[PDB]
Design a protein around this ligand. Sequence first.
Ligand code: NAP
Ligand code: DQP
Length: 316
Amino acid sequence: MATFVELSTKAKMPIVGLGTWKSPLGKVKEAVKVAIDAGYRHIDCAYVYQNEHEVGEAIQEKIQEKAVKREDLFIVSKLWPTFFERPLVRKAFEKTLKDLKLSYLDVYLIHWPQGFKSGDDLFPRDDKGNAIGGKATFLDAWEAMEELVDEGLVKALGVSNFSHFQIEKLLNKPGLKYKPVTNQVECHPYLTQEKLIQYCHSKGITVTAYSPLGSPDRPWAKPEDPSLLEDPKIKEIAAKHKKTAAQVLIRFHIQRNVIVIPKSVTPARIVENIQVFDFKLSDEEMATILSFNRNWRACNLLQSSHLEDYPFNAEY
Ligand SMILES: NC(=O)c1ccc[n+]([C@@H]2O[C@H](COP(=O)([O-])OP(=O)(O)OC[C@H]3O[C@@H](n4cnc5c(N)ncnc54)[C@H](OP(=O)(O)O)[C@@H]3O)[C@@H](O)[C@H]2O)c1
Ligand SMILES: O=C(O)COc1cc(Cl)ccc1C(=O)NCc1c(Br)c(Br)c(Br)c(Br)c1Br
């Protein structure tokens, strides 16, 4: 189904993908199967979601049943920041690839720019809940990740939650073998990322929008927190096309040429979320939606600010 966004490597990244954060075991498998049936080809995964082994089962089921070919799939995973020391990059990725039951990843992302204490405690923190840093940096990680590409275990590298300063830091590293093909960040009408998107696009870096629906199931959600799916102005635009709010929030990205990865394990929503290629938001509707920016992050902590390379203090 989906149209694509051309990467700098000329690989074609499907513009709508399936999110898998918090997709439970015993539902993520069916989620993936339904999505591939509905025409999804891009699946967004991560080591830290601890459900890649169930994602792997589903992908293998559908390739073996002729529903899809491996080369038409676009599989993305992410390296967690406790594994930034070189030998741990390899062991984490190998766990990821084995779980996914694949011979290669299409894209491997640095999940978060700050290094955390190395090892298999994924969330090292002090008593007060603040992150514990490790000395390895995202540049150390990138180095070991470039080997995976040399060996063809990964077709391309990317970053996630990077501000333009840290991408500059990355692109200006003397000795860089490969460049990031995407920057995966939170993006939606409340956090429109105009400056970051402009920046990345000018450096030949695509943007992948995460939490496009305002991530309404996030466990740290307060009832006073803004809710994009219930936003009357968003709902007004959807009604105007006889579409759902989710469909408008997804199509918003497509029209900015931004890749977008709504998560669902509900078959109807998964199908709904990819029916976004039969309407168009007008120029005035795009303008209106863009105006909703209030720099609101659904995904934030301030529990790791004390570490170097915190991405959200910068303006973009
Ligand atoms: N790189 C990063 O740091 C990072 C951070 C956050 C997220 N992620 C990626 O981005 C993906 C998407 O973001 P997200 O999971 O935070 O939240 P999201 O996709 O904005 O929203 C997910 C929530 O919306 C519900 N939903 C999905 N479609 C719907 C629809 N059509 N109508 C009403 N509700 C709907 C889902 O419910 P059901 O599942 O019950 O259907 C789920 O509760 C993640 O799954 C993950 O792959 C990456
Ligand atoms: O990546 C996903 O799909 C799910 O993302 C999450 C899931 C949970 Cl339970 C809690 C927080 C997030 C999240 O904010 N991720 C982006 C993010 C990460 Br990563 C890290 Br590390 C830090 Br520090 C900060 Br701040 C932020 Br913002």
